[PDB]
Symmetry: C2
Subunit: 427 residues, 2 copies
């Protein structure tokens, strides 16, 4: 009937990690009240605007299903207003930095006093107690700190950031797990908890497979499925071989599978003119026979050299170079359809152009057209979890302070006090 | 005490996505029974082993805090055992494929009749109803399907996979949100729901920022924070210009800032010899005077060609190049401390080796030594969410079928009735 219907979210967040978390809670039915500073608001509003004096797409795509109040919290009457809101809130969400909320007059300890049931949820750069606990962290800094950058890209290039928001939105989603887990605890104890997610830790969690590989490397001195282990395939700077001699930390493997199933990024017709004309092709062991049939190589079916993972690992790049010749006169989707005949794990690199206007993603509610009568409609990503008993209803992002008076009435305030709060500039 | 204490989890999952999800639920207190194929078990047991005939680090790092039973579900005595288990379960989790669970006898409709409170959770490649409902996907295929590969890497190279498990673990973390949301809903209705996460959708959620960029590109013709917005900076492999005059889909921007402020990956002292001797360095808008002091360009403070984001668009990559010049004699951590004095957001690329031995990560419970007397101790990633009122207790991954008898005895079955199942090869 809507999972978070009746959950009151007092939302101090700004930028991406925090706002991503509360938006998604909003999509699941929560009543999200965004507290914004008087005059300015969330810095995403003015960030890379596509039209002057209109809230940016950075703002709108992270702040749907929210209401906005302006509030000067450096003010005695504003701190009092927060106290009432805190008494009515189920969860407060924040990303102010290492000691900022306490400095504002709101200790965890004081918060428990005001409401024994409220949950305090925070995003930080580094975990509390960490030596770098006070370092400031944006998106790519967190990718660097959590091991992703070191292990992404190519052996002869730099550490490389992912286009995906491994640091920001990923942290927000991990924080949503934490908040929902604290809600389940509260059903037993009747009490709220403090939950926090550090961006470094959210990234490390997705980089679990590389910590696996670091241990494998420490124990054996080799990762036989990595490109560096193939006979003279990779080269340093001066034209000579690379190898796991002298490699002590997980290296970049380009477009290697990253797991138990070898893969590579294979060019398709149009690659010279189109940056996204590629397919990813995975050799799943249980269907090497089917692969042999597609690429017309019956000799490889019965040959220990090309028919087991172990036989295969010393010449992966020759096998991928050869499969790739088969795709030179076929586009992405033709290659994909061809492979779907055999149930092969092969699919296209989808461009952002293709995804934004894909009819399937819109049918299933993953890409959603938001009706925004103030700014014009925009696309967004909806809820990536689909439920049998409920569908989200996505609603446009709030103007700065649009809901101030409406929210103040909900607390229980008169037209007298509201009009004087506007004169005193606390709202 | 622990959030998911009392939650019985019936876990059919193999590989990474489902197993990450159920492991994390286990870290949070859940009673996770992993149901495995007789004789074989989860294929991760045998993938990338570091010691022959010992469950790989792949399996153990995704299957802590679980128990294992072997069950042949294709037999009628197996299906009967399942029925008793479903009646006892709070959530079932599966990644079998589109029609697979229904063909095994257990439709959502029958599952509801057996247990009206059970939640059915599934990971899929593509969402139900998608034209590609039927395609087979693993990690890097999902990355390609969801936009990450197209927007990760460099403009003169291929689509690039991320080292982070954007497809698998990310999907599992998203499914955890869905399961936890279904549990909060069930407190109100007394009823279980079906939840499903598609890997494409979990990837796309993290690439939300690039859907912002795609609409900005369509609306305005330019992405001013991207390297390609600097004249005569970016060129393809043939030496052709790359400008937003001709780009209609969000391009790869190398090490550009993403949802952060403008930044780049800059070389430090070790770089020709140490793949990970770099920092990520951000030029935040409000921090220009500080950067000018740091790099000793006082002349750049009051110059309009340098002192606004808009003025730097035509030269941003030249500025990074000049900043990098000041790091040639300094390592990663020195550069980081130096930048930190100025409040500049800047951190090192942490290698997996550095991450595996970092004392802070072990102290905060993020990198954890699991006690495994059978296989020898190993490291794993712990819970990335930290709570005020509880600490996870991570225990070693199960051997195949280690807990079969134990589990059957909790179901009710007495000793001689269990012996008949071992002989008939149901278990």
């Amino acid at each position: 009937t809507k999972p978070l219907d009746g959950i009151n979210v007092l939302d101090f967040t700004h930028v991406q990690a925090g706002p991503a978390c509360t938006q998604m809670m909003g999509f699941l039915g929560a009543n999200v009240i965004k507290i914004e500073r008087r005059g300015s608001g969330d810095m995403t509003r003015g960030w890379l605007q596509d039209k002057p004096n209109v809230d940016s797409l950075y703002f709108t795509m992270f702040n749907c299903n929210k209401r906005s109040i302006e509030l000067d919290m450096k003010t005695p009457e504003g701190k009092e207003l927060l106290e009432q809101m805190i008494k009515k809130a189920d969860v407060m969400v924040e990303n102010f930095g290492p000691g900022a909320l306490d400095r504002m007059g709101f200790t965890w300890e004081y918060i428990q006093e005001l409401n024994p049931r409220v949950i305090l949820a925070s995003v930080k750069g580094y975990a509390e107690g960490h030596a770098n606990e006070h370092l400031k962290v944006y998106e790519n800094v967190a990718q660097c700190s959590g091991g992703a950058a070191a292990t992404t890209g190519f052996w002869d290039g730099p550490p490389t950031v992912s286009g995906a928001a491994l640091g920001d939105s990923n942290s927000g989603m991990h924080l949503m797990i934490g908040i929902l887990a604290a809600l389940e605890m509260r059903h037993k104890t009747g009490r709220g908890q403090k939950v926090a997610v550090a961006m470094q830790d959210a990234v490390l969690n997705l980089v679990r497979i590389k910590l696996r590989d670091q241990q494998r490397l420490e124990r054996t001195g080799i990762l036989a499925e990595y490109p560096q282990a193939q006979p003279n395939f990779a080269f340093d700077r001066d034209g000579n071989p690379l190898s796991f001699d002298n490699i002590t930390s997980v290296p970049r493997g380009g477009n290697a599978g990253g797991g138990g199933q070898p893969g590579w990024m294979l060019k398709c017709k149009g690659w010279e003119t189109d940056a996204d004309s590629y397919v990813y092709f995975t050799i799943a062991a249980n269907m090497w026979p089917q692969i042999c049939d597609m690429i017309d190589k019956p000799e490889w079916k019965d040959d220990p050299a090309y028919n087991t993972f172990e036989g295969r690992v010393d010449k992966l790049m020759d096998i991928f170079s050869f499969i790739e010749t088969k795709f030179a006169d076929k586009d992405k989707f033709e290659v994909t359809e061809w492979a779907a005949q055999y149930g092969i794990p092969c699919g296209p690199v989808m461009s952002m152009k293709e995804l934004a206007h894909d009819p399937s993603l819109q049918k299933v509610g993953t890409v959603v057209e938001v009706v925004d009568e103030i700014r014009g409609n925009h696309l967004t990503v909806g809820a990536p979890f689909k439920f049998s008993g409920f569908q989200p209803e996505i609603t446009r992002a709030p103007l700065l302070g649009e809901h101030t008076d409406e929210v103040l009435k909900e607390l229980g305030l008169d037209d007298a006090k509201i009009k004087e709060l506007h004169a005193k500039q606390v709202v």
